[PDB]
Amino acid sequence: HRXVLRDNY
Amino acid sequence: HRXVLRDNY
Amino acid sequence: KLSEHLRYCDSILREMLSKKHAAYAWPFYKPVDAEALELHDYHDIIKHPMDLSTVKRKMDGREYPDAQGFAADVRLMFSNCYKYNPPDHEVVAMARKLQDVFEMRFAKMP
Amino acid sequence: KLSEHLRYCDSILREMLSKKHAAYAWPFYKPVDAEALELHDYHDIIKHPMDLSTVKRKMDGREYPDAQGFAADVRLMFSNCYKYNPPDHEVVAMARKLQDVFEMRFAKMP
């Protein structure tokens, strides 16, 4: 549920 | 000794 | 058609979007992508999203009545990030770094 | 004064430096800052450093004899990153993402 920055791309 | 990216700023 | 103050604000915005600050500014370039990030509750917690591309289009659209409205949107952007994420999150550290850049330039507005 | 091929290479370089890829491209914008990063062995392990600002100044200086020399510098940049860092490092994942962008555009050069 935590934001994962690398998942933006 | 490992690179820390946030340490660039 | 921009005030002297909002012209200065536009230069702050250009700096925040420059490669100089990209290492910590990039998560704010575009609206938070709750779809790609699988943040199914993001738009329930954040009722008023904001990001730098949105601030830019409003500035370019001459939608800010004064420098104070520009600052309110920028701080909303940072506030949403502190509101949604745990305090130890790396994106919160990135927001604080970029906010340090913003508050310093904004305070020095002639 | 640029070949058709190196003009295309210059457009690849402009794309790699664009906000589109900033999330993973920013560590390559400038030379690795071994001083700021306290990497006291970086220039012992990496004998030939390379980065996008250096590729840009060489391209602007018309220093590449052909597209093959441009590609050799870009891959040197990625290779130095894989050579210095442990394979699980986040900057290695960022290099692989940016290299995927490079190899795909380079392969499609007319």
Side-chain angles (χ1 to χ4, degrees), chain A residues 3-5 7-9, chain B residues 3-5 7-9, chain C residues 2-3 5-6 8-13 15-19 21-29 31-46 48-55 57-61 63-82 84-104 106-110, chain D residues 2-3 5-6 8-13 15-19 21-29 31-46 48-55 57-61 63-82 84-104 106-110:
Chain A
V4 181
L5 274 184
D7 282 355
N8 214 67
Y9 48 88
Chain B
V4 181
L5 274 184
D7 282 355
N8 214 67
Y9 48 88
Chain C
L2 278 184
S3 324
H5 280 184
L6 289 137
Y8 184 88
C9 292
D10 209 3
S11 100
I12 301 174
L13 175 63
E15 180 182 338
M16 291 174 86
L17 290 162
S18 71
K19 293 193 229 57
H21 307 287
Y24 39 93
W26 74 258
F28 310 92
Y29 283 177
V32 170
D33 196 335
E35 194 170 351
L37 302 172
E38 294 192 78
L39 302 173
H40 308 118
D41 64 349
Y42 183 82
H43 292 292
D44 295 323
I45 288 139
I46 297 312
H48 300 288
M50 187 54 52
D51 73 282
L52 292 171
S53 78
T54 294
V55 177
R57 185 211 69 211
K58 298 180 69 171
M59 180 75 75
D60 293 342
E63 305 185 19
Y64 288 119
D66 55 5
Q68 298 93 296
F70 165 81
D73 264 355
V74 182
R75 299 194 174 116
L76 168 63
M77 183 184 70
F78 297 131
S79 164
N80 289 339
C81 184
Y82 310 136
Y84 182 77
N85 296 284
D88 71 307
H89 201 290
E90 79 171 339
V91 74
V92 157
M94 296 162 85
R96 286 176 165 160
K97 185 73 185 63
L98 189 57
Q99 182 161 27
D100 287 351
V101 175
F102 167 76
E103 301 286 348
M104 177 60 65
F106 191 62
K108 298 205 166 299
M109 183 180 24
Chain D
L2 278 184
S3 324
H5 280 184
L6 289 137
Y8 184 88
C9 292
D10 209 3
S11 100
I12 301 174
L13 175 63
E15 180 182 338
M16 291 174 86
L17 290 162
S18 71
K19 293 193 229 57
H21 307 287
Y24 39 93
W26 74 258
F28 310 92
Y29 283 177
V32 170
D33 196 335
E35 194 170 351
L37 302 172
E38 294 192 78
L39 302 173
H40 308 118
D41 64 349
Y42 183 82
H43 292 292
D44 295 323
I45 288 139
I46 297 312
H48 300 288
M50 187 54 52
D51 73 282
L52 292 171
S53 78
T54 294
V55 177
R57 185 211 69 211
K58 298 180 69 171
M59 180 75 75
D60 293 342
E63 304 185 19
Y64 288 119
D66 55 5
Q68 298 93 296
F70 165 81
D73 264 355
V74 182
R75 299 194 174 116
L76 168 63
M77 183 184 70
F78 297 131
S79 164
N80 289 339
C81 184
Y82 310 136
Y84 182 77
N85 296 284
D88 71 307
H89 201 290
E90 79 171 339
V91 74
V92 157
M94 296 162 85
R96 286 176 165 160
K97 185 73 185 63
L98 189 57
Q99 182 161 27
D100 287 351
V101 175
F102 167 76
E103 301 286 348
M104 177 60 65
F106 191 62
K108 298 205 166 299
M109 183 180 24

